[PDB]
């Protein structure tokens, strides 16, 4: 997830739906938010 979010194309939006599923629970809850702050 961190690699995909870091290599996103320029001038492009990123959409992550169903964010509740990963947070409720490969799968991680704090890993995604840690990767976001990277």
């Amino acid at each position: 997830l961190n690699h995909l979010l870091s290599v996103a194309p320029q001038q492009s939006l990123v959409l992550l739906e169903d964010v509740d599923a990963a947070f409720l629970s490969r799968l991680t809850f704090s890993g995604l938010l840690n990767a976001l702050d990277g």
């Binding site: 194309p9 320029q10 001038q11 492009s12």
Partner: protein
């Protein structure tokens, strides 16, 4: 010569120093970025012939 990179630099310097050049050519920078984003800009360059500065 046109092969050397100083050609474009000298032409840009000329088109800046001599703002009122009656004879000139046009160079268009066109780039279509991904997601269909088009960037255009007109750079004006001295025309072939004789010019005095």
């Amino acid at each position: 010569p046109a092969r050397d990179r100083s050609y474009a630099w000298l032409l840009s310097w000329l088109t800046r120093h001599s703002t009122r050049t009656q004879h000139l050519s046009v160079e268009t920078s066109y780039l279509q970025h991904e997601s269909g984003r088009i960037s255009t800009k007109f750079e004006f360059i001295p025309s072939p012939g004789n010019h005095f500065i």
